[model samples]
Target: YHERRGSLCSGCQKPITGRCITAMAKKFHPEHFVCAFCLKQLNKGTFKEQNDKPYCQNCFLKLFC
Candidate 1:
């Protein structure tokens, strides 16, 4: 039988299973959820949201600060 289906990834818009990241009230594959500008991977608590997109701390400061 298929494993329990998981939430759709916000970035890829595909179903997720095994490991998943939940942010911005949405779910994403860990590799798919990244900094909007630099495309760097971000930790669940180490990311900031802007315009509904995720941004790493350095990128967020560079872009918005």
Candidate 2:
């Protein structure tokens, strides 16, 4: 099983594998990983709290800060 490289989803804590998604996209892969809050990429730096999440640094700081 692939583990998410970033923090758990704000909505769901399951392991993410690819790009984070907040809204539905036509070109997006259904199985790809995404953010629960904003539908963005899920990287170690995505949420950037103690670490990152699917959210970008700006969004992460806004939510976390």
Candidate 3:
């Protein structure tokens, strides 16, 4: 019955409910969208894209800053 939504969170690979975040050409749940390096939850403009994966500020600095 929920298949009609047809939207999934790229981060956790789960179905999105009423709200979702779309970035880097994919859909994400606010809580599911996390840093690839540290696994910290991320907000828009607070993450860095490394080869298309998201990283938090701490991880970004450690990885590339």
Writing each residue's lDDT as its tens digit, candidate 1 over 15-62 gives 887678898789888788878777868767678778878888777787
| RMSD each, Å | 1.9, 9.8, 2.9
lDDT of 2 by residue, 1-65 (tens): 56535434345665345554443221223344444356654443333432333444666677777
- Candidate 1 vs candidate 3: the TM-score winner is 1
Residue 25 local lDDT, model 3? 77
Candidate achieving higher lDDT, 1 or 3: 1
Highest TM-score: which candidate?
1
Q: Cα deviation in Å at residue 45, candidate 1?
A: 2.4
Give lDDT: candidate 1, residue 59.
75
Q: Against the unseen true structure, what C-alpha lDDT does each candidate score?
A: 0.79, 0.45, 0.75
TM-score of each: 0.75, 0.31, 0.68
Model 1 C-alpha RMSD vs. true structure (Å) is 1.9
**Residue-level lDDT for 59 in candidate 2:** 65
Q: How would you order the candidates by lDDT, starting with the best? A: 1, 3, 2
Off by over 4 Å in 1: 1-3
Q: Give the lDDT of residue 64 in candidate 3.
A: 86
- The backbone clash count of each candidate, in order, is 0, 14, 0
